[PDB]
Amino acid sequence: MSLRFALTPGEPAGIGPDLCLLLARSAQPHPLIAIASRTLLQERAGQLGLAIDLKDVSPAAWPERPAKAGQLYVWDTPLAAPVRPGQLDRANAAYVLETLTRAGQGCLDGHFAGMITAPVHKGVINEAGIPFSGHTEFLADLTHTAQVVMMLATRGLRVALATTHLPLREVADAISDERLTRVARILHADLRDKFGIAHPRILVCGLNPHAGEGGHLGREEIEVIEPCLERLRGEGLDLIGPLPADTLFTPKHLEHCDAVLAMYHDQGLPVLKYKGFGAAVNVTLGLPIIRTSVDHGTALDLAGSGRIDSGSLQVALETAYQMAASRC
Amino acid sequence: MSLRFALTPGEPAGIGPDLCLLLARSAQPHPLIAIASRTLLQERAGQLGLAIDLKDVSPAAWPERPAKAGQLYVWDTPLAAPVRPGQLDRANAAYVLETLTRAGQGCLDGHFAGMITAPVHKGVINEAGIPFSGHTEFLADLTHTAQVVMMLATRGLRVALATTHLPLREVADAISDERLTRVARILHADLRDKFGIAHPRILVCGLNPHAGEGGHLGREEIEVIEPCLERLRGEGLDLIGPLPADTLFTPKHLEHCDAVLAMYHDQGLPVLKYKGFGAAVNVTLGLPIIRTSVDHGTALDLAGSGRIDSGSLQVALETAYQMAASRC
Ligand SMILES: [Mg+2]
Numbered sequence: 146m147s148l149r150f151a152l153t154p155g156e157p158a159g160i161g162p163d164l165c166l167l168l169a170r171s172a173q174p175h176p177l178i179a180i181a182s183r184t185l186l187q188e189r190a191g192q193l194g195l196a197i198d199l200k201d202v203s204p205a206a207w208p209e210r211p212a213k214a215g216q217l218y219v220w221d222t223p224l225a226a227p228v229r230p231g232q233l234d235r236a237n238a239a240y241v242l243e244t245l246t247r248a249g250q251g252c253l254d255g256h257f258a259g260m261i262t263a264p265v266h267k268g269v270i271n272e273a274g275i276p277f278s279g280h281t282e283f284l285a286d287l288t289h290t291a292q293v294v295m296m297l298a299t300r301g302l303r304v305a306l307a308t309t310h311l312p313l314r315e316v317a318d319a320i321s322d323e324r325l326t327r328v329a330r331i332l333h334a335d336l337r338d339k340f341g342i343a344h345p346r347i348l349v350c351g352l353n354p355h356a357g358e359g360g361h362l363g364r365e366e367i368e369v370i371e372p373c374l375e376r377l378r379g380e381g382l383d384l385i386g387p388l389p390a391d392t393l394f395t396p397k398h399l400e401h402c403d404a405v406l407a408m409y410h411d412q413g414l415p416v417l418k419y420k421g422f423g424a425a426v427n428v429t430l431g432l433p434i435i436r437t438s439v440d441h442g443t444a445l446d447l448a449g450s451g452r453i454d455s456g457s458l459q460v461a462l463e464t465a466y467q468m469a470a471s472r473c
Numbered sequence: 474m475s476l477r478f479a480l481t482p483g484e485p486a487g488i489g490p491d492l493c494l495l496l497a498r499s500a501q502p503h504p505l506i507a508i509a510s511r512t513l514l515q516e517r518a519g520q521l522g523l524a525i526d527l528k529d530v531s532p533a534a535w536p537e538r539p540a541k542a543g544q545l546y547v548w549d550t551p552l553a554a555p556v557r558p559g560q561l562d563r564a565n566a567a568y569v570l571e572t573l574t575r576a577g578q579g580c581l582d583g584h585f586a587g588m589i590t591a592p593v594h595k596g597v598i599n600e601a602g603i604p605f606s607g608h609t610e611f612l613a614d615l616t617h618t619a620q621v622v623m624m625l626a627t628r629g630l631r632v633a634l635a636t637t638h639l640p641l642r643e644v645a646d647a648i649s650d651e652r653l654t655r656v657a658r659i660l661h662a663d664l665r666d667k668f669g670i671a672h673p674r675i676l677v678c679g680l681n682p683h684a685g686e687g688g689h690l691g692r693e694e695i696e697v698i699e700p701c702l703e704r705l706r707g708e709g710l711d712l713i714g715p716l717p718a719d720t721l722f723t724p725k726h727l728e729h730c731d732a733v734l735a736m737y738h739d740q741g742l743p744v745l746k747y748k749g750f751g752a753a754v755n756v757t758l759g760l761p762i763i764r765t766s767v768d769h770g771t772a773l774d775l776a777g778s779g780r781i782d783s784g785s786l787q788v789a790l791e792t793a794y795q796m797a798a799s800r801c
């Protein structure tokens with residue numbers, strides 16, 4: 146449809162290119178424009194044994210229909226140095242951010258209805274001397290978004306996180322009224338606007354096991370979480386909880402739920418990965434644009450070996466398509 | 474050779490008595506002795522519209538054969554006050570602990586092969602002025618066991634915990650070389666001795682997300698967990714990890730392990746409950762006796778209603794029977 150999507154293979158030495166090529170074996174419901182190096186993809190394809198019709202595409206006139214099953218659109222972006230699967234090279238660090246910038250600005254301009262990102266390697270970018278806090282932070286800065294919320298999803302289950310990549314010992318003190326308020330509002334606003342859910346029903350996990358057990362297993366629920374959720378409900382948000390995480394994450398309770406708000410990383414991702422057989426899409430909430438991503442790393446050691454699972458990227462693409470439909 | 478098992482209905486006002494009465498409709502493979510008030514059981518039976526014959530048991534003659542279908546052995550233990558389903562009464566707190574003591578001491582004295590516990594209400598016990606941390610802690614003290622290991626299980630999945638009922642902020646400092654080492658050894662030994670697994674394959678979770686990510690998200694894996702597990706692997710224990718929790722909990726890996734060892738409550742139980750809530754048994758490892766239990770609450774508002782699921786307690790019974798046969 147008139148809805149175009151930018152696909153960023155990410156770190157050239159990683160499986161990003163691989164995955165994108167593998168998913169090029171099937172025709173897409175929409176024109177999927179891969180912003181990367183033609184040569185990169187060509188070689189990776191040859192290395193994988195696969196055969197894809199890397200069809201060049203120019204900003205002068207974007208495509209209109211999806212590439213044939215075995216073809217992949219490519220908005221060529223030059224590498225700085227040749228590539229070898231599984232071998233990082235700081236010389237190509239700028240090339241990575243270039244693809245991300247093209248993809249992000251494209252969405253901001255309206256040429257792209259949304260973007261899907263394959264794995265990037267933070268370490269090699271920092272080694273090139275390029276300021277890079279991370280994949281998500283980069284896009285946030287590009288879109289001038291001060292606050293974002295990380296929401297993981299698999300078919301039939303969405304889990305937003307109050308805290309993300311932090312040592313477990315730093316979690317408890319990070320749970321504040323301010324933090325929960327910011328996260329809840331963004332989660333609500335986006336499920337409504339980007340997923341077409343008028344009144345999102347969000348189940349909220351307690352921080353402590355058994356959600357603090359009436360205050361006998363931690364005080365955070367009584368002192369912080371409960372008062373916060375109470376105020377938010379009065380403001381219109383349908384937040385249910387705090388509920389014990391191991392009670393909430395069950396078919397019964399999830400049946401009438403649009404998303405689960407977990408307090409920290411390992412409290413919500415295991416169930417999601419279990420359910421989806423390791424396939425999960427990472428959605429950045431709070432941005433003016435639509436962006437999804439796979440949750441796994443670059444897997445340098447598996448690059449060009451074909452021994453990879455494209456489930457995550459597959460789910461990442463579908464989620465992006467759906468969001469655009471509901472309205473960006 | 475004859476094996477007797479103690480059964481404790483637990484909190485009188487809860488559904489424990491109900492569950493024990495319902496399961497009594499089927500003849501057991503071993504004599505199952507309910508340690509509770511005979512009058513309580515007879516009244517709850519009438520309340521439920523169930524026809525169960527209560528056969529008195531004397532410590533002077535522990536029955537060798539199982540009771541008949543529709544019959545339940547009862548070692549009468551007096552209540553302090555009449556019981557009203559759904560209504561807690563601190564006057565009966567001592568009664569609860571008395572039945573637990575009789576069961577535990579009965580195993581320690583060699584009369585019982587194991588014990589199965591139905592739900593108890595910790596709150597009413599503490600309100601009666603009796604220090605009680607919970608079921609597991611009470612038994613560890615009664616048996617003078619310094620370290621026990623809580624393991625939840627359902628068909629196809631067993632999850633042991635390094636720490637249990639602890640506020641999240643206390644978890645990190647609790648993961649010590651001493652604790653982890655004891656916990657791992659107990660899990661390996663019991664899977665070998667009580668579950669008949671010659672060479673247990675155990676997947677171990679890191680404390681931090683991504684298992685610390687090379688020490689970038691916490692140093693515990695590097696400084697404590699890795700060294701400990703490495704030490705034990707050098708002793709023949711097939712422990713794999715530490716690995717990211719959301720990686721270990723994928724079908725791909727679970728299919729090849731005998732148990733998962735999570736560092737804390739909400740890191741491992743959500744997946745277990747998602748997979749087998751309603752057929753999940755809580756097994757206390759490390760005790761000099763065998764004890765299993767359900768992991769649901771007393772459901773005070775369902776007492777006397779008959780709208781309950783005895784599936785969990787059923788699995789708890791079968792698990793104790795199997796463990797005892799395997800050998801305490
Ligand atoms: Mg629990």
Ligand SMILES: [Mg+2]
Nearest residue numbers: 410440682683
């Ligand atoms: Mg992660």
